[PDB]
Amino acid sequence: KTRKLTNILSKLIDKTMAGTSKITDFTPGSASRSLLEAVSLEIEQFYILTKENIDWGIQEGIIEAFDFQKRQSKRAYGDVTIQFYQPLDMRMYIPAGTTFTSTRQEYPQQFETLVDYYAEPDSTEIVVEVYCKETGVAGNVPEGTINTIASGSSLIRSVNNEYSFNTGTKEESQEDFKRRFHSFVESRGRATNKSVRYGALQIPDVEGVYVYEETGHITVFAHDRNGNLSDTLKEDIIDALQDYRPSGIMLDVTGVEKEEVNVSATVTISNKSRIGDTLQKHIESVIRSYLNNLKTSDDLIITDLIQAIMNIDDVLIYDVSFDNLDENIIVPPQGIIRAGEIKVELK
Template sequence: METRKFTNILSKLIDKTMVATHKVTDFTPGSAIRSLYEAIALEIEQLYILTKENIYWGIQEGVIESFDFKRRHARKAYGNVTLRFYNPIEEDYIIPRGTTFTSTNQEYPYQFETLVEYRVPKDSTEAILEVFSKQTGASSNIPENTLNVMTSSPPSLRSVSNETSFNTGADLESLEDFKKRFQDFVETRGRATNKSIRYGAMQVPDVEGVYVYEQVGLVTAFVHDRNGNLPDTVKKNVEQELEDYRPSGIMLRVAPVIKTLTDISVRVTLSNKDRISDTLEHHIEQVIRTYLNNFKVSDDLILNDLIQVIMNIDDRLIYDVEFSTIHGNTITKPEEIIRAGNIDVTLI
């Protein structure tokens, strides 16, 4: 769609006036009539721009709405917490639905709760529960070993901890991701193809990555959420979703990905030795851990990319980065996913 520019509108107004009357002749910059026409031209140009944007928006929304395609809502973070007891419990212990877990770390004031009732069998020394954040959005994600308080905890409880980070919290889907997902939707209208199976699995909101492995008579979809896991509820939802996408007469299996824990030991040289502190060391460790825990299935660890992530923390302060545990790129198998193992940061 072609629109008129400010200069074209202004010149048109001046030309029309000069043809229609000889009483107004001063159109030089700064004159009263010129200033008035410039204001009018600006308003008309803005009207053209808004009209163009509204037309494009209407076309785009009309196409998307015709397929009942909507943006994904914000998601809650979830994951497992481990309860450990001083001694084997003497009888079955019931953990009711709605039991809340929190952290003494003021940086993470979020509350997590159980959505179902759990029964811890007699003689158990530990129990693993799945908990969900009460808040939605990416801000509810937490690192490992953050949750350490349980409401109404039994006297025999020794410790509470989330041994892995929670990364499943997500904000409202961005317009860029929404448009890309709709484009994938259009491209995978052909059913029973590799792309369509991948797209079908990605339709489940908690799914973050998919790898489709095809064999004679069998198709395996390796699926994971943002934590790198495949909870039973997510697996069930994926299997139901793929009923409309799987090839006829061929068995389709949904399986978890294979986690590969990557240990990182890094020496970071600073240009200002006065900045060496435990706080900076912990911050660099968290940046590395978050970067690795955001990998998807089949993603390779490129050493230069990891170095750049560390340098981006403060490229003036960080002078050099040297690894002792990895000496090159880490190439994964298609069904594997990289996750952070032990992260050791030394500042020099």
């Protein structure tokens, strides 16, 4: 694949010998061997450079063409303001590596300048750029954090960073980069049940989509958080799925077959003094949250509801019973369960 230093030197010597017999000393310390060794070192360094470039190209060349940037790890950097008590009475000099720090336990991060700076006599305040010593987001200190110089002259009135730092980043892994590329490529797909479902889900107010396929017809079930499908949202879905549906195929949009379950419960309780309106409303809010959290294909298992109600409190709640709920309410994929009228009776 590549030559190396010893091989390059050997070939150079062999070619030199073949070219002429006027040189035969190739021992260490020879001018000629030194020159060939230097050329060999330079060539080996260019080989490593080519290796680095190709290793970068293998994993970033193609995907970069599609406007996808891999996030490199960076040091947080930004501008800071240094104010002087008076206009400077001589040219002040700040050497590279001059450290800036903060007087807090929340931000022990240390910042330093990477270049020399000069403040003219006429100046009264000069801005400089400082770089966080550590890579990562730990250097993204908020506004007003950097407020101290460790090697500044007494003439300074105050140090302050005028804006929060945000350039600190963590390296994006190769697998995440591939996943984003592959996601984008999949999103280019069209005229399929998966692609229709994806394009419906990209709509803002759509929470859940079921696509049912028939020969020569497609019907799309959608719902919002509430289990409802507004006419406006329906029209939006249709307009967005004009670009997605296959040619010569009919597409229809319909609401999800919502099913509002009314639950009257009788809750036995131990502490009779804690019986009141607030506990009733808390229990009812828990039941409503449980019922409304169910997704499109989720069946209402009564034993899990009982578990949840009893887990509100392991000793206070004594026993529960329902008259409406006699057996588990199985629903199809296109039929969501939602919270209906809820009543709770404390016993």
